[PDB]
Ligand binder design. Structure first.
Ligand SMILES: C[C@@H]1Nc2nc(N)[nH]c(=O)c2N2CN(c3ccc(C[C@H](O)[C@H](O)[C@H](O)CO[C@H]4O[C@H](COP(=O)(O)O[C@@H](CCC(=O)O)C(=O)O)[C@@H](O)[C@H]4O)cc3)[C@H](C)[C@@H]12
Ligand SMILES: C[C@@H]1Nc2nc(N)[nH]c(=O)c2N2CN(c3ccc(C[C@H](O)[C@H](O)[C@H](O)CO[C@H]4O[C@H](COP(=O)(O)O[C@@H](CCC(=O)O)C(=O)O)[C@@H](O)[C@H]4O)cc3)[C@H](C)[C@@H]12
Ligand SMILES: C[C@@H]1Nc2nc(N)[nH]c(=O)c2N2CN(c3ccc(C[C@H](O)[C@H](O)[C@H](O)CO[C@H]4O[C@H](COP(=O)(O)O[C@@H](CCC(=O)O)C(=O)O)[C@@H](O)[C@H]4O)cc3)[C@H](C)[C@@H]12
Ligand SMILES: NC(=O)c1ccc[n+]([C@@H]2O[C@H](COP(=O)([O-])OP(=O)(O)OC[C@H]3O[C@@H](n4cnc5c(N)ncnc54)[C@H](OP(=O)(O)O)[C@@H]3O)[C@@H](O)[C@H]2O)c1
Ligand SMILES: NC(=O)c1ccc[n+]([C@@H]2O[C@H](COP(=O)([O-])OP(=O)(O)OC[C@H]3O[C@@H](n4cnc5c(N)ncnc54)[C@H](OP(=O)(O)O)[C@@H]3O)[C@@H](O)[C@H]2O)c1
Ligand SMILES: NC(=O)c1ccc[n+]([C@@H]2O[C@H](COP(=O)([O-])OP(=O)(O)OC[C@H]3O[C@@H](n4cnc5c(N)ncnc54)[C@H](OP(=O)(O)O)[C@@H]3O)[C@@H](O)[C@H]2O)c1
Lengths: 287, 287, 287
């Protein structure tokens, strides 16, 4: 049976990026829908669970994407709710690539740390977006003491609360309104992630290269000026004075490989659920 | 040349269900359109009749779907009207599974009845959707005395009028607003079909198991709660007292075989027409 | 990798015609979008240039189509504006088949004329549509003195101005309101094209057969009444006395082969740009 991926995008039309990577992940056919909502996705899921039986079931799978993670999560939960008993197919959530990017970034940092981040302070600057929040969740699941930072405490605390509830972790929040406050927030940190919006610097070179406690820095912004000063986006563990740096393009190379590999896994069973935790498990295998 | 199926759906987006079965029926590519109307389908058909010649003409075909039986009929007629001379491709109509599902269910019931239902009362509860309307049509063509029931008389009468004109039969409409009236409507019936929307019970045990006239019951709803109480969805002629029951999965297995078979046939010539008459003929050969 | 074509259509839905020809040109997968604008295409293009690298880049390509050429050109320009350095894929513009049809027609006429039309008068009747405008452009590039005609001088001059700006040529414009005026306009012409809307006659038999200078006539309208009287739509260089005729079906046959061949070329490099000039160069090789 041919491997059929059904792409449910919350934006008006389905992401081209997700189509290419889906085909390179081994889907034989990709059929995409835009404007997917919790109310209309049920009948789409019916088409995946009532059309094939037994051995053939695993050859259909669902990918949920779009530009708004909370909208994607609402659809993803509606997909899982529609399943019952054996009437189910594997599914994946990766709105805007936030799951695969966060998983690649954290997996790379944890590996470079020696395999454990337990008990150590990790700071996520501008952590209030989807990539920062998923990064915070995975770091916290690994035992790091995570501080999720943003320009406003109310928004940072809201992000921490959301991560904490979904992932049953205990991320804390902090307000860092400017470069000075971001530079203070990383003092004593062992791992620093910059998860700011595209094209913005958050942590100048002098604010991390002289902090003895910092082991690893990682930056998800690929567009100059980079989130972290004094690195190149292609850096993938490059040493700077006994610290190691992961730039956005180095992280993004793993993300692509990981995203493709997740797609392939969807067709190996009818029971996969690929959200942050399961995507991160594979990221650690591949990093 | 590759086998190209063009899916013209009257709903806002194309049915996922129909994509899967089209691929499993042997299409090499499926390209789906929503919001198809009699007025806009002509240009779509032009794309299928002016792009290939000779032996390759048959490698493109048209599938018409959606959730409104009358609208699907009008689009399908507009497709046939666009053809002229040898400029045509094979086409199939199966809005909401109407033809392939009704053909499977009616063929199985007629077979279990000994090969004839002529002159006997058949009641289609919630028969105003595509599946109920084609069920009423095929039963009436077998000479059954058909009552097509719905919560409102005007919608039930419009469905009956549509059936009667299309098939040159005389189905009667009835208003059954609730459980009590549905139970009354099946009194004296020999065959009862439940064609209600997904996940609704229409006919509990007490409303059919004590009506001596009832020979066979058939339920199209696969999602619990099932349309008929006291049966299993996998039932395929299972005996309950002196009666036999067909559940949605027992019917559905044949519907899927029928649907896949018709898809493959679309690519074996450029002149096929697959509607109730042809699909029911095939169902009786395979049931 | 699999050859992925991304079809960007300016109409509400993607052309069926372009889907069939795209597959017959060798695309492994076609993913179609409607309602594409200069504003929204950038994100689509990003999906084609950030998902594959190295030799795989050329296995993704873009096709822009739709019924409004000016709209397609605006989208095509926005696609090209998104490329920088090596971050690009091959792209083609063929809204409503106007580039491939005009390229086929002009290539056949120039070939039949002996390979040169320089200095000779060419008249494009009803030349204000996309096929007529592209035909005028390509004839002028060959050195013909081109007169682009229509029922209203302002519209004809606007078409010539558009052609002249885009192709750096000097097409002129004339108003021909009726048969008698079109008959006067072809006097002295060596090549006459009718690019009128479907199902309209523009040039009666007597208006061309008695004009000594006319060498070749070509008509793009395949639906009777044909654009040119006294010929058959299947004519492909058929001799009428000392003149030759190309009917719409002779031209259309080459257009189909040319269109398929252009698609194949899109996957042979990541740098192809198939607009009228490059499409015409291939049309001349294939004529
Ligand atoms: C705009 C996009 N839209 C999306 N949309 C969705 N839905 N999901 C997403 O993830 C994205 N994106 C993902 N993004 C994105 C992801 C990866 C790369 C590229 C990677 O960051 C790496 O830079 C390449 O994979 C490097 O690959 C290069 O190096 C390899 C070997 O050479 P080498 O070992 O000698 O060095 C080759 O494969 C070559 O391609 C760029 C942009 C965009 C920011 C962004
Ligand atoms: C909501 C849907 N929307 C539609 N929409 C459209 N457009 N058309 C349709 O037909 C449908 N549907 C048709 N429906 C529908 C059709 C078939 C089945 C059948 C299921 O797909 C069964 O799960 C398989 O038939 C089981 O298949 C398995 O069991 C069979 C025998 O096992 P066994 O004898 O080994 O024990 C084997 O073929 C195996 O593949 C269910 C629902 C849906 C209720 C319904
Ligand atoms: C309404 C359509 N929509 C479009 N939409 C888009 N986007 N692009 C288009 O080009 C079109 N059209 C293209 N147009 C169009 C295109 C082709 C033909 C038919 C072609 O003209 C035929 O292919 C040749 O006339 C027959 O001759 C050809 O057939 C032979 C091969 O054998 P075979 O094809 O019979 O097998 C070739 O040698 C060649 O001579 C008719 C109309 C339509 C007017 C029009
Ligand atoms: N390589 C890939 O595959 C890929 C995939 C997805 C994302 N990314 C990248 O990952 C990064 C994060 O993505 P995202 O979607 O999570 O980011 P985002 O939501 O766009 O922005 C993240 C946060 O940045 C902060 N921010 C915005 N403007 C700011 C400004 N002027 N000054 C300071 N802070 C500002 C905000 O936090 P506060 O308001 O709380 O201060 C915001 O919540 C981006 O650079 C994106 O390009 C890469
Ligand atoms: N076994 C298979 O192979 C297979 C394949 C295809 C479809 N199906 C199933 O077959 C059934 C019928 O298909 P369909 O397309 O005809 O369904 P449908 O159009 O979705 O709905 C059928 C009818 O159900 C009635 N209805 C809706 N809500 C109701 C409610 N609360 N209470 C009572 N009646 C209600 C309506 O009739 P009124 O408004 O007139 O009362 C409606 O016209 C569905 O359950 C579908 O999932 C099964
Ligand atoms: N073989 C193929 O694959 C293929 C592909 C594309 C197109 N074509 C054919 O090529 C031809 C031209 O296509 P097109 O899209 O460029 O055409 P078009 O835009 O529809 O029409 C061309 C011009 O015809 C003139 N016209 C319209 N109605 C008229 C009327 N009643 N009387 C006189 N003139 C009238 C108009 O010029 P004025 O208003 O300025 O007078 C108009 O700009 C069509 O016949 C089309 O079918 C064939």
């Amino acid at each position: 049976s041919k491997k059929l991926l059904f792409q449910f995008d919350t934006d008006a039309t389905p992401s081209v990026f997700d189509v290419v990577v889906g085909y390179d992940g081994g889907a034989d056919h990709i059929t995409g829908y835009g404007n997917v909502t919790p109310d209309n996705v049920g009948a789409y899921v019916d088409g995946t669970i009532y059309t094939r039986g037994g051995k053939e079931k695993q050859s259909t799978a669902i990918f949920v994407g779009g530009g708004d993670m909370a909208a994607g999560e609402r659809v993803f939960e509606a997909v899982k709710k529609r399943f019952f008993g054996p009437f189910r197919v594997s599914c994946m959530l990766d709105s805007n690539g936030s799951n695969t990017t966060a998983a690649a970034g954290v997996a790379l940092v944890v590996k470079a740390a020696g395999g454990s981040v337990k008990g150590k302070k990790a700071v996520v600057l501008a952590g209030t977006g989807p990539v920062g929040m998923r990064s915070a969740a995975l770091l916290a699941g690994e035992g790091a003491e995570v501080v999720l930072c943003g320009r406003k405490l109310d928004k940072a605390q809201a992000a921490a609360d959301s991560v904490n509830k979904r992932f049953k972790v205990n991320v804390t929040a902090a307000e860092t309104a400017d470069d000075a406050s971001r530079a203070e927030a990383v003092k004593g940190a062992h791992f620093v992630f910059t998860a700011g919006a595209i094209g913005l610097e958050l942590l100048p070179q002098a604010a991390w290269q002289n902090e003895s406690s910092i082991e690893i820095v990682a930056d998800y912004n690929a567009q100059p000026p980079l989130g972290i000063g004094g690195i190149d986006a292609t850096d993938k563990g490059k040493e700077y004075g006994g610290k190691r740096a992961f730039g956005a393009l180095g992280i993004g190379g793993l993300k692509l490989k990981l995203h493709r590999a997740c797609i392939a896994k969807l067709f190996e069973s009818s029971e996969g659920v690929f959200d942050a935790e399961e995507i991160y498990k594979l990221a650690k295998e591949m990093a």
